[PDB]
Amino acid sequence: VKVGINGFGRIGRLAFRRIQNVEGVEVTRINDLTDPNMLAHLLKYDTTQGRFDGTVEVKEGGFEVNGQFVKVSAEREPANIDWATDGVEIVLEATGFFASKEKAEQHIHENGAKKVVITAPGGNDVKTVVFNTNHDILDGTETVISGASCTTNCLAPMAKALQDNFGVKQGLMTTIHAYTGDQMILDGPHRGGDLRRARAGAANIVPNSTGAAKAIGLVIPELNGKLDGAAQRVPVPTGSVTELVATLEKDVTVEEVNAAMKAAANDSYGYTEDPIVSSDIVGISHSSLFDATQTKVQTVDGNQLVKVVSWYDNEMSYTSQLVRTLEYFAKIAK
Amino acid sequence: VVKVGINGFGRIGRLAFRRIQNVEGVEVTRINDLTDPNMLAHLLKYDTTQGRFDGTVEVKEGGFEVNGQFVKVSAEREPANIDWATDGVEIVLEATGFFASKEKAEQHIHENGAKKVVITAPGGNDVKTVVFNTNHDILDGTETVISGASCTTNCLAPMAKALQDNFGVKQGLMTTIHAYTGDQMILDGPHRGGDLRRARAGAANIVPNSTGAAKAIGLVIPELNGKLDGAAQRVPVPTGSVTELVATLEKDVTVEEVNAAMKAAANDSYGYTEDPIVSSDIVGISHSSLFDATQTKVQTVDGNQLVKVVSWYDNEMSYTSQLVRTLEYFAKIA
Amino acid sequence: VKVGINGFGRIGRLAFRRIQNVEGVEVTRINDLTDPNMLAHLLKYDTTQGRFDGTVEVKEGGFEVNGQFVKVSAEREPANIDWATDGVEIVLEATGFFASKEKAEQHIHENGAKKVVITAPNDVKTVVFNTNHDILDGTETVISGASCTTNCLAPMAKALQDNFGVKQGLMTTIHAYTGDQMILDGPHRGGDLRRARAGAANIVPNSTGAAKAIGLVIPELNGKLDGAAQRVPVPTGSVTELVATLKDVTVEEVNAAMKAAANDSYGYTEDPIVSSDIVGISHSSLFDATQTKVQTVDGNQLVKVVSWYDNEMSYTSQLVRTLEYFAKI
Amino acid sequence: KVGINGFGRIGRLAFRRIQNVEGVEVTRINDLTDPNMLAHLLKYDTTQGRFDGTVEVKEGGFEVNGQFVKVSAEREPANIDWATDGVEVLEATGFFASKEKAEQHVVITAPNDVKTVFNTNHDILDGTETVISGASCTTNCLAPMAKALQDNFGVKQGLMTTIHAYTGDQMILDGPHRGGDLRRARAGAANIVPNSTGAAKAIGLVIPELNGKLDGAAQRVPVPTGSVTELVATLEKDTVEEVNAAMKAAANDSYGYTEDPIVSSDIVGISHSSLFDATQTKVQTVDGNQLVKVVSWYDNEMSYTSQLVRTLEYFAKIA
Ligand SMILES: NC(=O)c1ccc[n+]([C@@H]2O[C@H](COP(=O)([O-])OP(=O)(O)OC[C@H]3O[C@@H](n4cnc5c(N)ncnc54)[C@H](O)[C@@H]3O)[C@@H](O)[C@H]2O)c1
Ligand SMILES: NC(=O)c1ccc[n+]([C@@H]2O[C@H](COP(=O)([O-])OP(=O)(O)OC[C@H]3O[C@@H](n4cnc5c(N)ncnc54)[C@H](O)[C@@H]3O)[C@@H](O)[C@H]2O)c1
Ligand SMILES: NC(=O)c1ccc[n+]([C@@H]2O[C@H](COP(=O)([O-])OP(=O)(O)OC[C@H]3O[C@@H](n4cnc5c(N)ncnc54)[C@H](O)[C@@H]3O)[C@@H](O)[C@H]2O)c1
Numbered sequence A: 001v002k003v004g005i006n007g008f009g010r011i012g013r014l015a016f017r018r019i020q021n022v023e024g025v026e027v028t029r030i031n032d033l034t035d036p037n038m039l040a041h042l043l044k045y046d047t048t049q050g051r052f053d054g055t056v057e058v059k060e061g062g063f064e065v066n067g068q069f070v071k072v073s074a075e076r077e078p079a080n081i082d083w084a085t086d087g088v089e090i091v092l093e094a095t096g097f098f099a100s101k102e103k104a105e106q107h108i109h110e111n112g113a114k115k116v117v118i119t120a121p122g123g124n125d126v127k128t129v130v131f132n133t134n135h136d137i138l139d140g141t142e143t144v145i146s147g148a149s150c151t152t153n154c155l156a157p158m159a160k161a162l163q164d165n166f167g168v169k170q171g172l173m174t175t176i177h178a179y180t181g182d183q184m185i186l187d188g189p190h191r192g193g194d195l196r197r198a199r200a201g202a203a204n205i206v207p208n209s210t211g212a213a214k215a216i217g218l219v220i221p222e223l224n225g226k227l228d229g230a231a232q233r234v235p236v237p238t239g240s241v242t243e244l245v246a247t248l249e250k251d252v253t254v255e256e257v258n259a260a261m262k263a264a265a266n267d268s269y270g271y272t273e274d275p276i277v278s279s280d281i282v283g284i285s286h287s288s289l290f291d292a293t294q295t296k297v298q299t300v301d302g303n304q305l306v307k308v309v310s311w312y313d314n315e316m317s318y319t320s321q322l323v324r325t326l327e328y329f330a331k332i333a334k
Numbered sequence B: 001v002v003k004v005g006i007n008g009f010g011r012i013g014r015l016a017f018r019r020i021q022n023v024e025g026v027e028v029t030r031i032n033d034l035t036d037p038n039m040l041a042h043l044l045k046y047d048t049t050q051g052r053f054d055g056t057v058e059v060k061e062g063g064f065e066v067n068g069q070f071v072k073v074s075a076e077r078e079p080a081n082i083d084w085a086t087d088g089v090e091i092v093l094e095a096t097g098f099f100a101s102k103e104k105a106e107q108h109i110h111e112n113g114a115k116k117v118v119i120t121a122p123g124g125n126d127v128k129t130v131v132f133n134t135n136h137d138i139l140d141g142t143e144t145v146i147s148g149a150s151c152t153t154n155c156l157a158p159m160a161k162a163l164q165d166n167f168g169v170k171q172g173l174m175t176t177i178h179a180y181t182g183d184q185m186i187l188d189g190p191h192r193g194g195d196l197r198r199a200r201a202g203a204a205n206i207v208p209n210s211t212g213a214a215k216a217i218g219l220v221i222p223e224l225n226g227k228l229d230g231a232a233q234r235v236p237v238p239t240g241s242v243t244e245l246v247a248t249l250e251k252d253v254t255v256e257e258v259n260a261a262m263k264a265a266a267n268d269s270y271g272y273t274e275d276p277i278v279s280s281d282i283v284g285i286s287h288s289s290l291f292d293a294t295q296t297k298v299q300t301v302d303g304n305q306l307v308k309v310v311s312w313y314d315n316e317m318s319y320t321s322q323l324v325r326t327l328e329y330f331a332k333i334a
Numbered sequence C: 001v002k003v004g005i006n007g008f009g010r011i012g013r014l015a016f017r018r019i020q021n022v023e024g025v026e027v028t029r030i031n032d033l034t035d036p037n038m039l040a041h042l043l044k045y046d047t048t049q050g051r052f053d054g055t056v057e058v059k060e061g062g063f064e065v066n067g068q069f070v071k072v073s074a075e076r077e078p079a080n081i082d083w084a085t086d087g088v089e090i091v092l093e094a095t096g097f098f099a100s101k102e103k104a105e106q107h108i109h110e111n112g113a114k115k116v117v118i119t120a121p122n123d124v125k126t127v128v129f130n131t132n133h134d135i136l137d138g139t140e141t142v143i144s145g146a147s148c149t150t151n152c153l154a155p156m157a158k159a160l161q162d163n164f165g166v167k168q169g170l171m172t173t174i175h176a177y178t179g180d181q182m183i184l185d186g187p188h189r190g191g192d193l194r195r196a197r198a199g200a201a202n203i204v205p206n207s208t209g210a211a212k213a214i215g216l217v218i219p220e221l222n223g224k225l226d227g228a229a230q231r232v233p234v235p236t237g238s239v240t241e242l243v244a245t246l247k248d249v250t251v252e253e254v255n256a257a258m259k260a261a262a263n264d265s266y267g268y269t270e271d272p273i274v275s276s277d278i279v280g281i282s283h284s285s286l287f288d289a290t291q292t293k294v295q296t297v298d299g300n301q302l303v304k305v306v307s308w309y310d311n312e313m314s315y316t317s318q319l320v321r322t323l324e325y326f327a328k329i
Numbered sequence D: 001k002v003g004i005n006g007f008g009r010i011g012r013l014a015f016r017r018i019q020n021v022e023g024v025e026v027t028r029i030n031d032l033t034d035p036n037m038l039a040h041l042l043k044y045d046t047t048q049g050r051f052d053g054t055v056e057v058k059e060g061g062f063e064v065n066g067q068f069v070k071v072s073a074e075r076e077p078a079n080i081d082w083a084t085d086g087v088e089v090l091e092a093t094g095f096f097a098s099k100e101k102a103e104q105h106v107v108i109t110a111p112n113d114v115k116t117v118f119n120t121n122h123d124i125l126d127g128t129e130t131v132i133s134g135a136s137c138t139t140n141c142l143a144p145m146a147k148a149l150q151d152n153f154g155v156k157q158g159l160m161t162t163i164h165a166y167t168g169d170q171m172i173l174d175g176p177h178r179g180g181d182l183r184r185a186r187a188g189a190a191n192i193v194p195n196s197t198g199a200a201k202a203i204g205l206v207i208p209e210l211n212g213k214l215d216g217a218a219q220r221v222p223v224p225t226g227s228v229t230e231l232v233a234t235l236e237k238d239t240v241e242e243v244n245a246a247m248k249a250a251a252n253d254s255y256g257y258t259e260d261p262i263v264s265s266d267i268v269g270i271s272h273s274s275l276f277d278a279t280q281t282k283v284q285t286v287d288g289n290q291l292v293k294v295v296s297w298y299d300n301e302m303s304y305t306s307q308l309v310r311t312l313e314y315f316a317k318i319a
């Protein structure tokens, strides 16, 4: 299956990197808003994720990656990308500006692509897939799908384990997040109207909103309407952590919650009892990584509050799932 | 006019000195650290996070002058061997962070010593801990050793007490997103305290850590003894922190009633704001805590409620403002 | 004199702050690309420079600052700003997009302003205050307050010339990161493969014209200096090193010479300060005696002199001084 | 075998490299803390990444891919019984960087009295020396760049400026510096901080023909690792292209070459001692007189450590 990337940014470029070690999926075209020399440089060198494991050499209208040429273009409007020229069936929409069924669908047309995977929430009329949590829902007939938020991919397997063992009454999330491209490097007008993302992202603790908690219902229906949360963006260029304080149906101890998470561990959901820090989870392939050292169960007058926390690298952790769901989606084509 | 001595001319020590200049009834006449006067004079005049000193500091022999008035300096490691009486100092600010107990702080009190001591940190349960404008009434003036509590307790106290005196709290879990501090390593190296996370580079990591402030709230507000607990997330900002508290309350509430309740409880120590500020905005403030209405949450799921309240504090200056207020009040009733 | 600001950014907002404590010049309109609520918030709160010393409350089409409504607009083209409506004679061009004779002149029009001062870099007089402020007569439509680095380098280099004379020199400025860098690795619209990189997590080399275009300020050094930059992770505050061949000198004569040249713009210090210490200062440049070097090897000499400056406030202080002087004449 | 005194940044990274070298093998570590602390700091590394292996803590040590390594906590090196594990020592504490105190058992991982850069003056060693030094991080960078300038064009005099990452000897926040330095007292990760550097003047001990001709200072900046060295010099000869070409010729395993516009993060964890950057080369000719500027990257941690291990390997060979 031949794939195209619209938006060769952080998620776009890292997705490309992971596609190299996945047989049966292959990127043959990239579309951004800049010349090929810029994109080749940004693939080779990466501040947070390290230099590229390969060779990248710039050509005309593209660059070669270990010998295979990949065409690049600078088409701003998705309608005008001739995806069909390079046989691209599926497009990774990673611009962050066409994160809806309506605007993503402008990739699908004559001389266009068949299907689209948005690298972000895509609205409620689009299927939202956290791999190894609800990828079963996919049948292969969907024109537009979404890989969810970075925070949802983290929160899902941790919350799902709580439900399938103890059941959850309600919960409040707090994610301590790395700063991202949508923040200003220094104090300046934010085009999105946010008075906090306007502030210097790398020199401040800056609060902000996140839909991941409320829109969990679309991934795990049994938790619909039960959660809500906010974010605190802090000065690290990548790597985040999600805290969840919840009330559970049953009564629990610290050891049963940790043990329950260990059982639920897989390729996406990790487990650790080492006292790691944010830099330790940079570039990991797990979507989320439960940290047993931070588990709390506070019993006061029979009532219990449970706190569970899990790490995730917003960049690579999410990208790992986006690629897994892309691989699975490409196979059941149709 | 009560004359004071500083043991430990560090972050809290130096800032305390700065604030004591604009308080008439108290005046510092001696400083004791582990270095020459030229080092301490430089660190008073120039301050990365808090700005240059508002005055003139010139180095003399065995001290330095501040706006004319000479202050003696010494380099005595043992508190027992400081001749505090030579400079008439009745009260000592213990800001080394090594003598934070009744027993070890008491080594300031002796012949050729001081009369009383204020520890700039938790000092144990056999020592009264004072959060100013929350429980300073408890003091009578006869106490040899007292404590100004933690930076986080001074923040959490007025926010939690307001919740109790309006709605009552069943239980609560705290999360503080804290600035990095001197007890962390600048880069990955052996921590003398045995902490495998404070061993890590403090300014390049989200680093989880423990905090007693939440549980030891009982010593400040007895009606909340044993009801709270929490953890910390140290993040790369050199000063400025924020405290989140998720709690279950006796009454039912709305967002507006909790904000309004905090506004009522506001004073010189407990601030209030509805502006969407960030961490740098609270650097060098005089309020102990500053409630942020924009971050308030009240989540109703199936009749049950969870309440989230958040407040800023500058671990350095916010705490120091209370430490000085408690010092002023204590000096008067001696 | 009534003034307007086009581009309420770092330099724009700080200029506004300093204009409050100068009587006889006064801002009556701001033009940017966003609503008034955004600009009011960014004036009140400032990460690097501290909270505003005043009161700001948002109204319609503007905000009040200690009283007196100040209009705000979101006009993209300079041609289409009706500056005359609010009586603004002079405009601060701080967008960083109209730094030329032709494009700055689109402020000067029938519905518009009389004159313009661009907040950056030859058809235009380039003025570093207390270094070549003489040059203005008051009849110039467009002028420029030079770069942040030029305002720093000028008084340090001029002192070297007026005492010892300069053969040639190479500059290295260790600069704070700025808004033209990417917060994270992404395509730079300007095509720079280094400002494309995460500005706050890298030492990033970059070019700087300030060194060569010294001739425009002080003709006596024209063509003899050149330099580059190293952008480093601090949100504001920079330092300029200059290694030069000059008479023969000692360390003490160079320091003493700089102290003599000190004034309101050119500072002097012998304290071992660091970048955070110079944040928000009013001096354009601040010579640091502790870093002076004079290396004599086989009769030949190399001289190294270093001076701090806060790209933001240091420069802004001069821009406002030049604006004040220009408004009078 | 080798033993490590000071399992810090340079100590631990040296250990890491020692795994991918046959004929050298570390069997003892001595620091000032328990084995559990050192095992954690080997497994996890903020700047250099997680350890490529398996680490499990035991009694008085920890196992690395099955083989136990002893650990001890002796402050005075005289009383470390190195002979117990057959060690024929990397002095990486930074407190015993002298003939007298290092001799008290050696390769010092830092700077007259002792031999001082692999592939630049490795010939000097014969194998009979009790005390030798791997030089500074900055010298290992500057040496192959300066040596190339001499062996092609010859240099009159030069002034160095190194933009350096912050290091463990700086304070995390403003506080009294043990060493009395009023600038390393300041918050290392929130400031441009000027500092002194011997590397430039003490180049004579590595390249004698340059003795007394160079000098420089440092600017410490907020990055946890990765540095760059600028050198402005006047040469004996009278273009940009010949200097770049000359460096390319001098390139080897230690001295790298690049014409890509990289930044500090790109050189983190590299094995080259120095990496010449052609994009930053300048030659300014004004009135017949010339000034030449040449710049080269180095990761103070791993770049230096790569040489320290290479010189350790070579030194072990000719014992
Ligand atoms: N960065 C993260 O941590 C993270 C995590 C989860 C998902 N995401 C999502 O991934 C997407 C990309 O985020 P990112 O961090 O990579 O952002 P980014 O800014 O790094 O990526 C944007 C890229 O798209 C390009 N672009 C912009 N407008 C375009 C247009 N009209 N047509 C084509 N290309 C255009 C940009 O030049 C750049 O190459 C967003 O939807 C974001 O929400 C990001
Ligand atoms: N930093 C904060 O935000 C904060 C907030 C509240 C409480 N505190 C408490 O304040 C105290 C000081 O913390 P800090 O951040 O100012 O630390 P710091 O490390 O900046 O201050 C310590 C100072 O004490 C000196 N010192 C060490 N041992 C000494 C001794 N035996 N005799 C004399 N001086 C000695 C050090 O040299 C240094 O000058 C600690 O108890 C800390 O827990 C700090
Ligand atoms: N940044 C510094 O420290 C510094 C130092 C020297 C000189 N300068 C120069 O000053 C200028 C301003 O740069 P800055 O650092 O303030 O950047 P900035 O990002 O703060 O300025 C950008 C501002 O201009 C506004 N803007 C953009 N396009 C506009 C348009 N068409 N119409 C109206 N407003 C528009 C933006 O919304 C924003 O408010 C640049 O030329 C810069 O080189 C600044």
Ligand SMILES: NC(=O)c1ccc[n+]([C@@H]2O[C@H](COP(=O)([O-])OP(=O)(O)OC[C@H]3O[C@@H](n4cnc5c(N)ncnc54)[C@H](O)[C@@H]3O)[C@@H](O)[C@H]2O)c1
Binding pocket: B188, B189, B190, D005, D006, D007, D008, D009, D010, D011, D030, D031, D032, D074, D075, D076, D092, D093, D094, D095, D097, D109, D110, D135, D136, D137, D138, D167, D168, D300, D301, D304
């Ligand atoms: N990393 C660099 O930038 C760099 C550059 C070149 C060489 N070096 C040199 O290497 C040496 C180590 O520096 P580092 O960066 O690894 O520092 P570090 O602080 O990370 O390493 C110090 C280690 O030695 C231990 N130690 C201290 N005193 C000891 C004693 N008396 N006995 C035993 N162990 C003791 C410490 O606890 C710690 O484990 C210094 O001389 C330094 O100048 C480092």
Ligand SMILES: [Mg+2]
Binding pocket: A019, A020, A021, A022, A023, A024, A025, A026, A027
């Ligand atoms: Mg492939």
Ligand SMILES: [Mg+2]
Binding pocket: B020, B021, B022, B023, B024, B025, B026, B027, B028
């Ligand atoms: Mg006083």
Ligand SMILES: [Mg+2]
Binding pocket: C019, C020, C021, C022, C023, C024, C025, C026, C027
């Ligand atoms: Mg005015």
Ligand SMILES: [Mg+2]
Binding pocket: D018, D019, D020, D021, D022, D023, D024, D025, D026
């Ligand atoms: Mg080996």
